[PDB]
Design an enzyme around this catalytic site. Structure first.
Site, PDB file in Angstrom:
ATOM      1  CG  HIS A 147     -24.122  72.760  -5.253  1.00  0.00           C
ATOM      2  ND1 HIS A 147     -23.319  72.883  -6.370  1.00  0.00           N
ATOM      3  CD2 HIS A 147     -25.208  72.054  -5.652  1.00  0.00           C
ATOM      4  CE1 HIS A 147     -23.871  72.232  -7.382  1.00  0.00           C
ATOM      5  NE2 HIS A 147     -25.037  71.746  -6.980  1.00  0.00           N
ATOM      6  CG  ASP A 179     -19.785  73.345  -6.044  1.00  0.00           C
ATOM      7  OD1 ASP A 179     -20.050  72.747  -4.962  1.00  0.00           O
ATOM      8  OD2 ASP A 179     -20.629  73.432  -6.994  1.00  0.00           O
ATOM      9  CB  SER A 182     -25.115  69.565  -9.220  1.00  0.00           C
ATOM     10  OG  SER A 182     -25.040  70.899  -9.654  1.00  0.00           O
TER      11      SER A 182
END
Lengths: 223, 96
Positions: free
Chosen positions: A44, A88, A181
């Site tokens: 992402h 992811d 992230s």
């Protein structure tokens, strides 16, 4: 990082800070060096120009240990699902290999299909926000406990224990947060997870990509 | 340039990157609606149908002076009113 402490400068030499161009602004992520020419992060975090800073502690200062390298090639997992945030994981091929030294060095990956037991204490690090009002110029880290899959199955309907890890005790103000992230979940000096998603509140548990479920793809992609 | 952090939550999930919009001028709310729906599509695969059938599909602007404005992404009666984006502190986007 919510609830953590400042890292000792350059104690986590695999950590990468990512600056990502998007169509209407920019994004910021973490990542971690896995070979002299490759950084692992979250899918992402993809964008239309990615810059990687290695060797940093204070990312807002001009430190002579910093190495700034553009990503040559950004390879998202082919089964990445943006809707559910499944699979992811993304590899960044660096435009040049790093100068390996005490401040920039890769982190070990798990063995193929290696597990991670509920109750294990792990560490996550990053440059993300530390609350709803403040951020950090310097690398921070926090210790989190791996949860029973049951906890994330109930909270997150798309959670899959075969490819993800459920991390963080809901009763502690400790978590990865916005801008973390792509950073690693380290358990006994091995990167088992990648920070993926959670709640806007920052309240755990949170979901990490399970690195050991992707080792064949990692190895093929780097070859 | 004026930088505006925003957060996207879809179906109770928030990806943990840090995202910002960059604005140069005045704009209509409909242009912010478009930027928001474009990021819903490109970050989380949200379609027009998903928005229109959702229990809630909104974004909330927080202005630098502390006022908050909740905008309905299904039907925004203020689409044609203007705002100076430099007054915007951050945007919270929620679908489902």
């Amino acid at each position: 990082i919510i609830g953590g402490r400042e890292s000792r400068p350059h104690s986590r030499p695999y950590m990468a800070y990512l600056q990502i161009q998007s169509p209407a602004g920019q994004s910021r992520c973490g990542g971690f060096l896995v070979r002299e020419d490759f950084v692992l992060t979250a899918a992402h975090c993809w964008g239309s120009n990615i810059n990687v800073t290695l060797g940093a502690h204070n990312i807002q200062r001009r430190e002579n240990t910093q190495q700034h390298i553009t990503a040559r090639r950004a390879i998202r997992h082919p089964q990445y699902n943006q809707r559910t945030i499944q699979n992811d994981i993304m590899l960044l091929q660096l435009s040049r290999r790093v100068r390996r030294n005490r401040n920039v060095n890769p982190v070990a990956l798990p063995r193929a299909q290696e597990g991670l037991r509920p109750g294990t204490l792990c560490t996550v690090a990053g440059w993300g926000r530390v609350s709803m009002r403040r951020g950090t110029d310097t690398l921070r880290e926090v210790q989190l406990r791996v949860q029973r899959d049951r906890q994330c199955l109930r909270i997150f309907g798309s959670y899959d224990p075969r490819r993800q890890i459920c991390v963080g005790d809901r009763r502690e103000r400790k978590a990865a947060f916005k801008g973390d992230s792509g950073g690693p979940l380290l358990c006994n000096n091995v990167a088992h997870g990648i920070v993926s998603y959670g709640k806007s509140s920052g309240v755990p548990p949170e979901v990490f990509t399970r690195v050991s479920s992707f080792l064949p793809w990692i190895r093929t992609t780097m070859r | 340039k004026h930088t505006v952090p925003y957060t996207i939550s879809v179906d109770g999930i928030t990806a943990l990157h840090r995202t910002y919009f960059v604005f140069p001028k005045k704009v209509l709310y409909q242009e912010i609606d478009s930027k928001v729906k474009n990021e819903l599509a490109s970050q989380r695969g949200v379609t027009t149908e998903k928005i229109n059938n959702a229990q809630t599909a909104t974004y909330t602007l927080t202005l630098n002076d502390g006022n908050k404005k909740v905008v309905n992404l299904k039907k925004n009666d203020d689409a044609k009113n203007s705002i100076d984006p430099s007054t915007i502190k951050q945007i919270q986007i929620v679908v489902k």
